[PDB]
Design a protein around this ligand. Structure first.
Ligand code: NI
Ligand code: NI
Ligand code: NI
Ligand code: NI
Ligand code: NI
Ligand code: NI
Lengths: 101, 566, 100, 566, 566, 100
């Protein structure tokens, strides 16, 4: 007996199903580490990360909500992106879109 | 991508199909539904989801909620579901999916710059409890009840006076006015009960016009057929509730005479089992009638090994009885019956008894209404197994039936369900957040009208709020004007119209009671059973349809020694 | 710990009993508050041990005798009452004429 | 039928001829009269008398009392009688026989649906005490005094500042306004004293116009003939009282010079014995004059074995004196005299000293005014036997003489006797209920303006209010608006007319002082003796009509170690 | 006549040339000037100077001060001098020579009948502290801070909610209104910060119009260039301050990008060292810019042997990070650097960092802002010796530089210096009195708006205020209406004009912020250094003009184990 | 003494630990609040002695074992945190999984 214990049924949860995704190779050209959150508009991340910003337009990291991907200086890796939903309007970040798309 | 169910539960709390143990009891609840879109759950913290342009939108205050409880496991009479809860203007705005509509799908609860966040992942959220049997013996009772998870207190009293020690009555206009004024200082919603023991209607109308939301008929002030009829006549014309503590002595008649005096009119019977007061030994037979809304006080819940032993002296002090006077001790003993005490637990499990209350400091424990209600559910599962209504391998239905006993049912009985009693849109945001391991025992957060009013708090000078010693301390929602804005003082329709709030210069929000005469047993959520119940005059045995109703006393109970320092 | 108001209130009783305990140990005849605190604290520990209400109602009358307290004290305490968390929840223990 | 006297006493408390021991002292009181009709006593509880149609009538609120104290043993300056007490609108309605005129005879206090009940059978009820020597060093003093049974506090101060540490003065309009506002937060009736040490009348009139009900002349601010004359001149024109702490140093003159400066005008002399301040060593000779209302502060009451030893260092800290400065220590010593300390007790027993007060935290104990007054009575009975005025085999007269010292006499001296000071119809219902075994030490209930403000309270979560730990806790009468309605802020007639209450937005009830200039020694109830008293300049011996006045120091006192934990 | 210097110091406190040790540190202050006339010092007490016609005059209230602090040793940013302090109408009237002009020379602070006295001889008096980094997690923080000597608290929060646990934000109009109302109950001056993380200006303007005096940009809500620009644009038009907690993750850019986004606009950078949050690992380089007002939170002050060890878990709980999530632990570690922690102390000693704050219960200790500031000064004197600016054999300049960090500089940064922040005529009388042996640790008296609000208080029932137990208790200045009159609620100019105070029915005095956009680094008193500072991306080494900046961790600190029970 | 609110708050923790201490001595298996109070009070004294934060983070995991507490208690306490005045000022001690 453990007070308030969970009895989680085994299996897996499929995240962000039925949505467009794309893979991109990213490389940190900066001298300091960069960490990106799950819902940040990838196309507007720190300018030191080199990748096809055009392909990442309207996309975010396809990872469980609240988690992140870290890039140490000089680190190169391929990430999977998932398209934004809702109104597909981007406001904030580096202020590059500030509107629909 | 993909994530395992266990890892998922650790991050966002359980989802559909997962089961959770309630505290250290044998009760397990299973998540029935989850209103989220997997991958779009909102989470707050460093580098999380709720951030500008991401999980937080660009809308003005008018278009977003003031507060959001993220990933909450709701336990209410209507369901056990996983969802985000939005609170706006001190009231429940919506139960759904929170976030930013600009980039997220299915958002029903918009989060903006004006939104505060309470992380409920891994926690259970319930409506605040409602105790309708309060003896206002001391103001300290309000903090004790609030800490237990009770946010509304209905009762009567003027302080530690003999009349209040024994009865839930705030006698007359002067005392009523005084107590309504004092109520502004307390962090719980309050409604008062006047002394209904009189055979002159005008003496009752004055009290209702002064502010009481109900009338208490108590045997200590004379629970005679004439007084009962008078109170009910006034209740019928002023839309207020009557609470009854019948004639234990059978002085004016037996239970059948009292029932006849009531004449099919709506009435709330306090401690229907009898130990707390009532026709000896059959007051319990009242739960068979359609116009009776029956409740239990808590010292007899549940039946345990030490229950009987502690009752005699408790009875005496509560009613100013003299142990040297033979007649006083004989009538105290006729109220304590193992037979009816054991049956009461079963009647609750069957839904024949619809409410639980305390009877604070007058044969009841103010901080143990919720705790004892769950102990009964546990003892009943252990003894009787699954209820006929259960579906699936969980105790979901029994949990819904029991939570209704101290939330929605007391609200319906007293005509305040339009304001509080459950987690439904439009109702006051009185919410209680619990960690599964401490469910029903010690809350993580108690929210009153949209503001946290009390919570466990560690070292004030510490670098974080968690270091020891951690104990309950009043928060901003319990302070001065913020408190007034987050609590309600319930008045009768007559008092409201008479301008009582303006005259007494009451500072808190005002709410009016209504629908006290139209509620009947059939309206009690999950507890509408009207059994063909009988009590043997000689043996005191309780039978329903001829079958003997009984249970065994517990030697050890959950939610007890594992949690309390004393 | 998440101490509720009632748990913190009982800490006051426990501490009052520590005072009495030390004085009884010195050989002093206890006064009114000291006697009430000592017997009360005794019952609370009894409940923690798992003793029944019935047993404590009896045992409580054998903590202090008339020769260990000041004159008039036994008469100032017709009974002592205290509640504690027994294995089966909170229960009330009433000890009649605890000092004889 | 018939009932034995002992059984009767156990049920309704003592009656005519029965005697009761006050706490653990040697003082015994005998019931002088009983206003009941045997067999018609009202009692509340399960199956008792106060029930609909029986001891409770059918009258409307306007025709019955709000509260009744049943079977109370009243101890007041006018008598020691058994009776029911009716309270209506926060004031004493009647002292007589309570019940229902419909079926009971001789009912003078009608009980109806609007009536709350306080069971006083077996208890002693007295008026709330009045301490007129308060140093407002900290607000916590109010709760300490209230718990002891004192309901009115008159004094001055602004908090823990040097000026307040030494004197009872709230200096000027700004501080006076601030303290009047802060007073609304305290559960006791309050009146303030301004700084009367000035030789410019207008500087005094401003303070009176701002709200003070009196002026304190203190030697620390210069108790010179000029300042004294100025204060008395303003007092005479504004109907306020002057409290004096004379020139101990004899710097401006001797006691005869101060008396000459007073010029037969009414004045209240604080700590007339001298230890607390005053012309060394003969300030005590002031009690011989008709215009002097003399009081004692409590550390010298009564004369005990440890009295002298504790005084030197107490004196120093209270007056900011330097023990390294020879002149400072010499003047501290000239104030402490075994001779005058011993005589003071006797002078109280004779009625030459008319009041007792504390001198809170400035050479006095705020929670020990009542307690010490009774210890003096005990020590005096033990040493001097019965008073010449005693009749019967009891101490009734000595009890009436001493209770007057902290109730009616302080009220008369400060012009507030029309509102408080005794249990008489029309006066504010400030009452204190005591159990005989704890009389003067620890009250059972303290009532302020008709509402219980503080009382001993057991476990808040308990099934009854009696389980341990039992300690004093604030009740509804001490809460927010209820408190404002149950307490009084006393103002000068000038302040009242100037609209000070409206300007400062004071929330509590307002009362005005009057009759401060017309009271004289002859008006002090049971304490109007003007003895031909002399003090030997060299030996400090006190003599009345040539006979030496003295007493012996106590080694042990009642109301001490048997009741306190520390 | 003549008097020796030692005897003089014992009676009136030290004078010109005398040195005093601050608590148990190695810091010594030397009295620079004394505004008295030898022989004419005012002293209060039995037979002292402040008496009618002597040190006290005949003037009306309008022509004398309400309160005088006699013989005080003032320690402020402008000087360390001996003088009397006059307070009138709750504000600082004058710093000079008190007394009666009728018989004394050079009197600039007249004492009359309306004057209260606080004896400050032998005590140090300072302005009340100002903490601009408060997380309103619980109301109890106000008493803790007040007791430490902090009288003004600026921050944000709604209680123990996740958003407030991590950020100083009171989200939106509803919560802002609620917190402004609750503020009336607290004994400290209060100003609120709203959530500035939005890219829609109107959502920010609403919050300012509702009452916040600043906007907090926090990375937990998204510290992106767009959000930063938006907040600064609104700040520029509404004259409010912006507090920043930058993007530690370097997610939107590096420190140079954030600085570029700021674009030379005024901004207050919280915990500029970085442990509390900010671009890893070079946020500290911000102190080089003219538009940046840099502060430190207190857990890293000063660098000690146990500093690093306690930080990791503290970081996690404060930001709702998951220790099982690798990325969460990696970003927590990148914030804790021995290199920047050691450099921070030196930068404070050099005046590159201008303020100290707490970061209450979210990586900071509310009662240790003052205490830790002095510990840094001590450790810096011990390690680096005298500052280049020191004159004479004392630490006067270092003391002035450090006291400015928690008094005048925070006031200037937040636009409230016209009301509080220093002991200057016209400013609110928020003063703290200290005994030299307890300087910076435990105050003797805390004055709010001219009234003592909290102070150490002994046994309430004692004959004097000094007997044990002595602990901090609320005084009259912290009570009801007196409190409202002695505290300030700061509002934005827009809120003030919109009638927010009238609408919410705020009871306390209102003050408006102004001058938040025009302050720059050069305006920080004694702390205006803009060093050419660099941080090595790999080694984290901090260098100024190429030279390595560092210090050694303390094993033992003053103002620690000698004063605290736990 | 001039006790600040935080010093008085810690007196509550100390007293709670005295209760637990006496019960452990009787041979009882400690409950949730008793366990938290005992380990916490242990750390506070460690700081008074002058032990480092690092040492206490370790030592704190050896005050109570799984066999000295009630079932479920070890799981109800994933960690314990308390602050005390070390020779170098106030520091936070976090003991992960104190009971094993
Ligand atoms: Ni009842
Ligand atoms: Ni009841
Ligand atoms: Ni005096
Ligand atoms: Ni005095
Ligand atoms: Ni931060
Ligand atoms: Ni912060």
């Amino acid at each position: 007996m453990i007070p308030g214990e969970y009895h989680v049924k085994p299996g897996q949860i499929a995240l962000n199903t039925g949505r467009a995704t794309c893979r991109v190779v990213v490389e940190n050209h900066g001298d300091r580490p960069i960490q990106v959150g799950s819902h940040y508009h990838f196309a507007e991340v720190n300018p030191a990360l080199k990748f096809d910003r055009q392909q990442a337009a309207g996309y975010r990291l396809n990872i469980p909500a609240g988690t992140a991907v870290r890039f140490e200086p000089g680190q190169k890796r391929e990430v999977e992106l998932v398209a934004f939903a809702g109104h597909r309007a981007v406001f904030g970040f580096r202020g590059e879109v500030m509107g629909p798309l | 991508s993909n994530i395992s169910r266990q890892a998922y539960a650790d991050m966002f709390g359980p989802t559909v199909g997962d089961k959770v143990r309630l505290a250290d009891t044998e009760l397990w609840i299973e998540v029935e539904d989850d209103l989220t879109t997997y991958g779009e759950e909102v989470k707050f913290g460093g580098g999380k989801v709720i951030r500008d342009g991401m999980g937080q939108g660009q809308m003005l205050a008018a278009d977003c909620v003031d507060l959001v409880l993220t990933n909450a496991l709701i336990v209410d009479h209507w369901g056990i579901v996983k969802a985000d809860i939005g609170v706006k203007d001190g009231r429940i705005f919506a139960i759904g999916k929170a976030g930013n509509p600009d980039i997220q799908p299915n958002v029903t609860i918009p989060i903006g710059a004006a939104t505060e966040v309470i992380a409920a992942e891994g926690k259970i959220v319930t409506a605040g409890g409602i105790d309708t049997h309060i003896h206002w013996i001391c103001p300290q009772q309000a903090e004790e009840a609030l800490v237990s998870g009770v946010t509304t207190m209905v009762g009567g009293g003027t302080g530690p006076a003999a009349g209040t020690h024994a009865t839930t009555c705030t006698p007359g206009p002067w005392y009523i006015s005084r107590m309504l004024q004092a109520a502004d200082s307390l962090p719980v919603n309050i409604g008062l009960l006047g002394k209904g023991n009189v055979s002159q209607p005008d003496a009752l109308r004055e009290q209702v016009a002064a502010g009481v939301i109900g009338l208490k008929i108590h045997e200590d002030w004379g629970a005679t057929p004439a007084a009962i009829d008078c109170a009910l006549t006034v209740a019928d014309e002023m839309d207020i509730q009557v609470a009854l503590h019948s004639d234990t002595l059978n002085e004016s008649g037996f239970v059948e005479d009292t029932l006849a005096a009531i004449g099919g009119r709506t009435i709330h019977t306090f401690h229907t089992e009898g130990a707390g007061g009532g026709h000896a030994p059959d007051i319990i037979t009242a739960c068979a009638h359609p116009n009776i809304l029956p409740s239990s006080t808590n010292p007899t819940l549940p039946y345990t090994l030490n229950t009987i032993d502690e009752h005699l002296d408790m009875l005496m002090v509560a009613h100013h009885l003299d142990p040297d006077i033979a007649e006083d001790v004989a009538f105290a003993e006729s109220r304590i019956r193992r037979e009816t005490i054991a049956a009461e637990d079963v009647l609750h499990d069957l839904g024949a008894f619809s409410l639980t209350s305390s009877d604070s400091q007058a044969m009841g424990r103010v901080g143990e209404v919720i705790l004892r209600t769950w102990q009964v559910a546990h003892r009943m599962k252990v003894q009787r197994g699954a209820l006929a209504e259960e579906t699936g391998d969980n105790d979901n239905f029994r949990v819904k039936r029991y939570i209704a006993k101290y939330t929605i049912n007391p609200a319906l009985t007293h005509g305040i369900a339009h304001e509080v009693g459950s987690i439904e849109v439009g109702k006051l945001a009185d919410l209680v957040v619990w960690s599964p391991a401490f469910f029903g025992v010690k809350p993580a957060t108690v929210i009153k009208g949209g503001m946290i009013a009390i919570a466990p708090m560690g070292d004030i000078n510490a670098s974080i709020p968690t270091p020891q010693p951690v104990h309950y301390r009043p928060m901003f929602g319990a302070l001065g004007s913020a408190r007034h804005h987050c609590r309600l003082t319930f008045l009768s329709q007559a008092a409201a119209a008479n301008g009582v709030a303006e005259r007494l210069n009451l500072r808190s929000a005002i709410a009016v009671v209504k629908g006290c005469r139209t509620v009947q047993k059939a309206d009690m959520v999950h507890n509408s059973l009207q059994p063909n119940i009988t009590v043997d005059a000689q043996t005191y045995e309780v039978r329903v349809d001829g079958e003997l109703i009984t249970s065994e006393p517990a030697d050890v109970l959950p939610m007890a020694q594992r949690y309390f320092l004393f | 710990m998440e101490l509720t108001p009632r748990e913190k209130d009982k800490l006051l009783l426990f501490t009052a009993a520590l005072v009495a305990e030390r004085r009884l140990a010195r050989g002093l005849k206890l006064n009114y508050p000291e006697s009430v605190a000592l017997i009360s604290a005794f019952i609370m520990e009894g409940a923690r041990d798992g003793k029944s209400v019935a047993s404590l109602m009896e045992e409580g009358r054998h903590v202090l005798t008339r020769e260990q307290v000041m004159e008039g004290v036994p008469e100032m305490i017709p009974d002592i009452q205290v509640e504690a968390t027994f294995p089966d929840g909170s229960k009330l223990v009433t000890v009649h004429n605890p000092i004889i």
